């Protein structure tokens, strides 16, 4: 059973402090490992496109999910980023400048795409959404 | 800091000055003088904020540099001159004589006084000791020093000082049964009669005061100023006679006045 002594406040505080580490959410935000991850605790990161890659969809689906290999400028790390929307991979080229955001699940894969935790938001300073709707045009240079 | 601060941020100004939050980034920093910075009312506030003779800082300086305002019968040209409790402010051109007193809410009020009442003021004695050559003297809480004081006068007593001659004409011993006004704390500005005094060795002394309506409150010795012998003050009190009214009765009076 719990300790209940009126003079046992120290033990209760220490026990809670020790047991907090069993909590995964608490440990994630108190171990200081977010700075060694590709984004280093940022909502977005810019990078250079290295190569277009197709990723097979997970069972029971069957598709080729279009993604890009991006090297982050600020630390040189390499990640896989999904390119959403139909035919939007055609707006991406090798050595292009892309803005990368999270996939929405805080560092975890989404949907039937395996091992992909990022998506492309902008290419060459123009949002992919504008390119898909023809609102803007990708800069020639 | 590396030395004395010369500025005072407006939010850091004492609340009893009643300065607008958005009036500016600064408030008039009180100058060195007889009264402490937190327990004073600079002439700039009196002339501009209270009496509204001056509409601006520049107008206050212009008025003061004409030698038109006197504090304790002496002309003062310093805008931030610290004028505090019991001080007399006189403007001969307008035939106005004011005494600085705390209202029931603890804020300095310019109490208009008669010409006769403007020739004297009350002071609280800090201590009596021997100066050079063995000359006895006492100092008050408004920075004054008086030599050859009456041997009966002692610390915490009140002396009636004639401004024209700068001499003690009467004094009140600090004792039970005397009407006093509180000059500090939450009870500042209240008036009552001392009931008993609690003295603790190596600690502050507690004074118990009973209001004219029977309300009782206590404060420290340093926050008590004796106003007279018995129950009659030696000076005219402001409106309210140092009687603190509860918010309920204040609202009742306001509603009655509205109709």
């Amino acid at each position: 059973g719990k300790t209940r002594g009126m003079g046992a406040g120290r033990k209760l505080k220490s026990h809670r402090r020790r047991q907090r580490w069993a909590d995964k959410s608490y440990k994630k935000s108190h171990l200081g490992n977010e700075w060694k991850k590709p984004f280093a605790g940022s909502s977005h990161a810019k990078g250079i496109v290295l190569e277009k890659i197709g990723i097979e969809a997970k069972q029971p689906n069957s598709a080729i999910r279009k993604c890009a290999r991006v090297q982050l400028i600020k630390n040189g790390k390499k990640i896989a980023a999904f390119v959403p929307n139909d035919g939007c991979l055609n707006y991406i080229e090798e050595n292009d400048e892309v803005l990368i955001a999270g996939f929405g699940r805080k560092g975890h894969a989404v949907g039937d795409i395996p091992g992909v935790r990022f998506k492309v938001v902008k290419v060459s300073g123009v949002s992919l959404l504008a390119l898909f709707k023809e609102k803007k045009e990708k800069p020639r240079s | 800091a590396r030395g004395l601060k010369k500025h005072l941020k407006r939010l850091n100004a004492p609340k009893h000055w009643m300065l607008d939050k958005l009036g500016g980034a600064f408030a008039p920093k009180p100058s060195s003088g007889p009264h402490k910075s937190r327990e004073c009312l600079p002439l700039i506030i009196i002339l501009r904020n209270r009496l509204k003779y001056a509409l601006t800082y520049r107008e206050v300086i212009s008025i003061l540099m004409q030698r038109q305002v006197m504090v304790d019968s002496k002309v003062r040209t310093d805008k931030t001159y610290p004028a505090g409790f019991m001080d007399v402010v006189s403007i001969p051109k307008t035939n106005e004589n004011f005494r600085l007193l705390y209202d029931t809410k603890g804020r300095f009020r310019l109490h208009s006084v008669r010409d006769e009442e403007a020739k004297f003021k009350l002071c609280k004695v800090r201590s009596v000791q021997f100066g050079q050559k063995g000359i006895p003297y006492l100092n008050t809480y408004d920075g004054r020093t008086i030599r050859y004081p009456d041997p009966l006068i002692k610390a915490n007593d009140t002396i009636k000082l004639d401004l024209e001659s700068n001499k003690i004409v009467d004094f009140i011993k600090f004792d039970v049964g005397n009407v006093v006004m509180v000059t500090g704390g939450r009870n500042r500005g209240r008036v009552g009669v001392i009931k008993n005094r609690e003295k603790h060795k190596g600690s502050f002394e507690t004074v118990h005061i009973q209001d004219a309506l029977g309300h009782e409150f206590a404060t420290r010795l340093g926050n008590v100023f004796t106003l007279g012998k018995g129950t009659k003050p030696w000076v005219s009190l402001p409106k309210g006679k140092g009687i603190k009214l509860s918010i309920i009765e204040e609202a009742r009076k306001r509603l009655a006045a509205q109709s």
Binding site: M6, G9, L12, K13 | -
Partner: protein, 145 residues
């Protein structure tokens, strides 16, 4: 008797080689040993009034006045020369758990030769000006226990 140092120890301002005698003189006058009462209801030990020790840090016979905080505690250590460690025991409130934890504070204090102290007895210490690197308190009373 107490001249155990390389220098002669004496009470300052107490003239000894006077042609007159201190018959009806007050303490510290006429060569008579100087002592004083510290106030706050504390009584001067009889061992300081009639003692021969020289201690400039003694509350009753030295040049140190008692002012500030008066604290009580237990004699934790009495191994230093004229200094003891006073252990103060108290309870710290743990707000979240609405409970208490034991805590202690070690307070170095000067003890005059007029007091006999032992590890474990109750002492009362008054605050004074800094006397050493860590000593700011003077033993005022000892309960032998």
């Amino acid at each position: 008797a107490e001249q155990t140092e390389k220098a002669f120890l004496k009470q300052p301002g107490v003239f000894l080689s006077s042609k007159k005698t201190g018959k009806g003189k007050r303490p510290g006058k006429g060569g008579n040993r100087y002592f004083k009462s510290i106030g706050l209801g504390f009584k001067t030990p009889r061992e300081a009034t009639e003692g021969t020790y020289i201690d400039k840090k003694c509350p009753f016979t030295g040049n140190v006045s008692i002012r500030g905080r008066i604290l009580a505690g237990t004699c934790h250590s009495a191994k230093m020369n004229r200094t003891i460690i006073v252990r103060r025991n108290y309870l710290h409130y743990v707000k979240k758990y609405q409970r208490y934890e034991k805590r202690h504070s070690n307070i170095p204090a000067h003890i005059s030769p007029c007091f006999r102290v032992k590890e474990g007895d109750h002492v009362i210490i008054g605050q004074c000006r800094p006397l050493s690197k860590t000593v700011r308190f003077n033993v005022l009373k000892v309960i032998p226990a």
